[PDB]
Amino acid sequence: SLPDLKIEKLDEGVYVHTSFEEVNGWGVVPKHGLVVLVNAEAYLIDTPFTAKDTEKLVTWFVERGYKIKGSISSHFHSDSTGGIEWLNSRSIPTYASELTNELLKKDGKVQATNSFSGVNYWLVKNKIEVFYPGPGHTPDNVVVWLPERKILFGGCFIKPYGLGNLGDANIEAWPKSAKLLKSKYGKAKLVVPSHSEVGDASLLKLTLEQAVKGLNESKK
Numbered sequence: 246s247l248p249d250l251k252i253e254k255l256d257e258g259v260y261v262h263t264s265f266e267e268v269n270g271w272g273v274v275p276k277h278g279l280v281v282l283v284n285a286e287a288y289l290i291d292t293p294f295t296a297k298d299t300e301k302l303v304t305w306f307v308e309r310g311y312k313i314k315g316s317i318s319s320h321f322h323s324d325s326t327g328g329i330e331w332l333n334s335r336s337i338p339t340y341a342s343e344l345t346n347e348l349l350k351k352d353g354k355v356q357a358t359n360s361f362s363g364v365n366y367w368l369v370k371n372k373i374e375v376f377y378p379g380p381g382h383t384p385d386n387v388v389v390w391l392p393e394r395k396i397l398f399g400g401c402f403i404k405p406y407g408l409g410n411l412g413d414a415n416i417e418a419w420p421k422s423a424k425l426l427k428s429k430y431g432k433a434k435l436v437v438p439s440h441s442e443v444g445d446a447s448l449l450k451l452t453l454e455q456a457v458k459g460l461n462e463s464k465k
């Protein structure tokens with residue numbers, strides 16, 4: 246009895262997909278990803294938690310006729326990578342940074358078929374940019390920017406009311422990383438967090454506040 250996959254339009258050619266999963270002791274957690282349409286080409290930004298929701302998601306666009314050209318995962322946790330296996334079984338290219346691929350293999354999980362590195366990677370020139378702001382939520386977390394719509398996909402890095410799961414976090418790097426991201430993408434119109442709804446650049450500033458706060462708090 247878990248909630249159904251949501252598919253909602255956010256902007257022209259940009260959809261938010263919402264999937265739900267019970268997570269440890271935190272109850273049912275919503276997780277936001279995007280599907281970015283580049284004409285007839287569809288790109289998943291993070292997979293749903295599960296293979297089933299990934300199939301549902303893909304079949305929903307395949308059914309309306311688009312070509313799934315690829316998937317990019319913003320960090321190694323299964324709320325970003327849960328459907329990589331299923332995609333791979335269907336010949337859909339999957340992408341992750343080399344670091345993200347190293348952590349997947351280290352946890353006994355299937356890896357993306359295509360890796361990248363460098364602070365900046367373009368999945369699609371002048372359309373989908375992949376950016377590494379430095380450790381935060383995880384050592385490997387990256388963000389995805391959509392220049393043509395001014396939409397920034399923040400992932401589990403963006404945490405405007407509390408940092409969430411610190412199990413793999415780097416509290417000491419987060420403020421710096423938060424500040425850089427803040428500077429770089431200060432002018433996004435929309436900011437899409439993994440576990441909060443879409444807001445504006447204010448969430449960049451709140452994330453920075455939480456990391457700073459989170460930091461002192463663990464110092465005492």
Ligand SMILES: O=C(O)[C@@H](Cc1ccccc1)[C@H](Cc1ccc2c(c1)OCO2)C(=O)O
Nearest residue numbers: 268271274322323324401407408409410440
């Ligand atoms: O670490 C994560 O990505 C989420 C938990 C998780 C871990 C491993 C596989 C799937 C899911 C976690 C979800 C979460 C958990 C607790 C939170 C929260 C968000 O915001 C406030 O409190 C997060 O992103 O921080």
Ligand SMILES: [Zn+2]
Nearest residue numbers: 320322382401
């Ligand atoms: Zn995570």
Ligand SMILES: [Zn+2]
Nearest residue numbers: 322324401439
């Ligand atoms: Zn998360």
Ligand SMILES: [Zn+2]
Nearest residue numbers: 263275277442
């Ligand atoms: Zn939502």
